[PDB]
Design a protein around this ligand. Structure first.
Ligand SMILES: O=C(O)C1=C(C(=O)Nc2sc3c(c2-c2nc(C4CC4)no2)CCC(F)(F)C3)CCOC1
Ligand SMILES: [Cl-]
Length: 134
């Protein structure tokens, strides 16, 4: 067992706040924002040895990353940015930093009660997306 075990499973989106504005800050175009904002993804998190896999599954699009904590990887985001990403565990929080074109955004995942809370931040704009077990 590992601390990361509290994340593993299949999670469904139950609430979203400020996501359109977060996407605007990131640079997502209008049509993608509208379709993304309508999505109700499932988030599937699994671990095999040192490799963590996170899959986001929705209508329109499925995206999946696999990574080792602390080890940078190149990532194509759901909005088609090519970014360089690093994910670490900081005091029980999974912290995902994405860098591209001199910009940065951070996505944090935290277990709070029976929820998986996702906080997305770009400059001063935060979006909070709450998932529950499917
Ligand atoms: O997993 C999340 O809740 C999180 C995110 C999420 O779900 N984004 C989703 S789902 C989803 C899409 C996007 C999306 N994002 C973005 C920019 C903001 C990054 N452009 O498109 C597009 C296609 C889809 F078919 F509609 C399905 C993004 C932020 O980090 C947590
Ligand atoms: Cl780490």
């Amino acid at each position: 067992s590992h601390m990361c075990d509290a994340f593993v499973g299949t999670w469904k989106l139950v609430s979203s706040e400020n996501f359109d504005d977060y996407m605007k800050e990131v640079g997502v175009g209008f049509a993608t924002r509208k379709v993304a904002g309508m999505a109700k993804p499932n988030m599937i998190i699994s671990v095999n040895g040192d490799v963590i896999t996170i899959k986001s599954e929705s209508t329109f699009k499925n995206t999946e990353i696999s990574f080792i904590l602390g080890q940078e990887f190149d990532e194509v985001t759901a909005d088609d940015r090519k970014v360089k990403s690093t994910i670490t565990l900081d005091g029980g929080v999974l912290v995902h930093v994405q860098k591209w074109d001199g910009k940065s955004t951070t996505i944090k995942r935290k277990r709070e009660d029976d929820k998986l809370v996702v906080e997305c931040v770009m400059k001063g704009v935060t979006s909070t997306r709450v998932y529950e077990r499917a």
